[PDB]
Design a protein around this ligand. Structure first.
Ligand SMILES: OC[C@H]1NC[C@H](O)[C@@H](O)[C@@H]1O
Length: 323
């Protein structure tokens, strides 16, 4: 079962691409075994021409794969921005990956490049997460069939190059809805652990959060609905139903932002992790270092432990380690 973090050094158009080896050392010493790498294709491509690939960028990803091997940490490479789609609003995509043949051609071009580069790296060490958080399947933007046909033909092209490559598929509705008609060999579907937004995204600048209620748990609030541990259990039970079709599931992003009081964060995260352990669902916290992380999270109500120049939320870490 995968347990770990997302690392963001290739996440943004302003990112350096230089991941920190000590992140891998420390999470290995804390007995974690998984990292997801959400990548912004513009770091090696172009806004106007989605077929540009600057191969030199991937020397940085080569290092991540080496460190994954060195420290026993599986690497999941993800396209967080691809031609025609990203949830990140720092750049507006002028095309629509879900409908536009040219964007889909470029999408496959990029994944074919990546598949070819790492064909020699086994799926024990490396998986591909094709696209981060597709939206709800409003067919005027992305139908269920739009999504499934694109994923299917992308997997086909990847596996002509590397037949054994493990593929991770995000749920629809921003990683929250299982995908019914994708029963493809050697795939995993990825859900999310941000429910409820009143706890996890309180005062978040990048969503419309101004009318969220004061955080509390239980009885947190999520797009009009109130949530508790039993409701979380029901939700993730619908996810592990995919195992009856030979599909594994895991939670590719989870956590709470750094303006939520710590007592609420810990009560909510404990409940989520109790459910994930109950149902044997793996997880990745959205940050290692950062606002959603166990390190350098800039919370005002935490007694941070020294961690080699960083600030460690020990209670959050130990919750993760025990589940
Ligand atoms: O995919 C990463 C993305 N997931 C959705 C979260 O709200 C956001 O904070 C994060 O940047």
């Amino acid at each position: 079962r995968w347990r770990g973090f997302n690392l963001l050094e290739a996440f943004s158009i302003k990112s350096t691409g230089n991941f920190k080896e000590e992140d891998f050392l420390w999470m290995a010493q804390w007995d974690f075994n998984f990292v997801r790498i959400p990548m912004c294709h513009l770091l090696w491509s172009d806004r106007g021409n989605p077929f540009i690939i600057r191969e030199d960028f991937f020397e940085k990803i080569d290092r991540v794969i080496f460190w994954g091997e060195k420290y026993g940490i599986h690497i999941c490479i993800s396209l967080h921005r691809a031609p025609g789609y990203s949830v990140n609003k720092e750049v507006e995509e002028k095309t629509n990956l879900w409908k536009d043949e040219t964007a889909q051609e470029a999408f496959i071009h990029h994944w074919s490049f990546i598949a070819r580069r790492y064909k020699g790296i086994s799926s024990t060490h490396l998986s591909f997460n094709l696209i981060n958080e597709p939206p709800f399947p409003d067919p005027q933007i992305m139908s269920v069939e739009d999504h499934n046909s694109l994923i299917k033909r992308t997997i086909t092209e990847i596996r002509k190059i590397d037949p054994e490559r493990l593929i991770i598929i995000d749920g629809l509705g921003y990683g929250n809805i299982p995908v019914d008609d994708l029963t493809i060999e050697n795939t995993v579907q990825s859900c999310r652990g941000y429910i409820p937004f009143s706890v996890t995204h309180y005062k978040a600048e990048w969503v419309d959060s101004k009318d969220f209620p004061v955080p509390e748990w239980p009885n947190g609030w999520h797009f009009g609905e109130y949530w508790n541990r039993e409701k979380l259990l029901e939700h993730y039970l619908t996810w592990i139903k995919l195992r009856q079709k030979g599909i594994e599931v895991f939670c590719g992003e989870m956590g709470a932002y750094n303006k939520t009081p710590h007592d609420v964060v810990l009560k909510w995260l404990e409940d989520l992790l109790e459910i994930f352990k109950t149902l044997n669902i793996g997880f990745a916290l959205w940050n290692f270092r950062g606002p959603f992380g166990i390190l350098d999270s800039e919370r005002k109500d935490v007694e941070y432990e020294e961690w080699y120049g960083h600030k460690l939320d020990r209670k959050m870490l130990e919750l993760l380690r025990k589940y």
